[PDB]
Amino acid sequence: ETTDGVYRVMTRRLLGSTQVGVGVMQEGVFHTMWHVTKGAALRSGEGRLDPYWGDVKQDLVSYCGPWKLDAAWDGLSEVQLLAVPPGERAKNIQTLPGIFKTKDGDIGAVALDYPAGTSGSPILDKCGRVIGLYGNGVVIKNGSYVSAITQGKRE
Amino acid sequence: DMYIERAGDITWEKDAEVTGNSPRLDVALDESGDFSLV
């Protein structure tokens, strides 16, 4: 199945069924983070999904086609993290993202803490557009987790 | 080997719980893709 929507990325190599990450299917392309799959091929029931593009520094990878998600944070409005935690249901979490300030510009960042198996969950704008993926960030002084809004480049 | 299974639709929800602060952080991104605080 290549139906649009959000998917869990599961593995059996360890104890039981374990959720390594989360991904997005859009326009026949599966979008997740690199550290989730480490570029490995994926199975979708009877089919198989092979990586098409990936970048370790961006922590992104696409399957069966180019990166299709092109929306970005307008910067101002609040967004929603469609978190799909391991063993739990997808739930939308509205938040006003912060700012990751780097030498190469500013990127939005949401201060939401979820198990590592939530890596790759999409972040949406008010129109439902995927503006980035969740799962690449830092740990601050009190030790909660703040993830960047990681978005790829279409075309 | 890994596999995928659907978890829901990509949709904004108006009855969504609102949480989380909006911190502004100076970070550095290394070649391996790991963020670090400055």
Swiss-Prot record, chain B:
State the superkingdom: Viruses
State the annotated membrane topology for this chain.
Multi-pass membrane protein
Instruction: Give me the ranges of the annotated region Disordered.
Output: 8-30
Where in or outside the cell is it found?
Answer: Host endoplasmic reticulum membrane
Taken from the record's topology, the Cytoplasmic segments are: 1-38
The annotated region (Interacts with and activates NS3 protease) lies at 4-38
Purpose of the protein:
Required cofactor for the serine protease function of NS3.
Q: What is known of its domains?
A: The central disordered region transitions to ordered by binding to NS3.
Summary of subunit composition and partner proteins: Forms a heterodimer with serine protease NS3. May form homooligomers. Interacts with human SPCS1. Interacts with non-structural protein 2A.
Q: What is this protein called?
A: Serine protease subunit NS2B
Included stretch of the parent chain: 1418 to 1455 of 3419
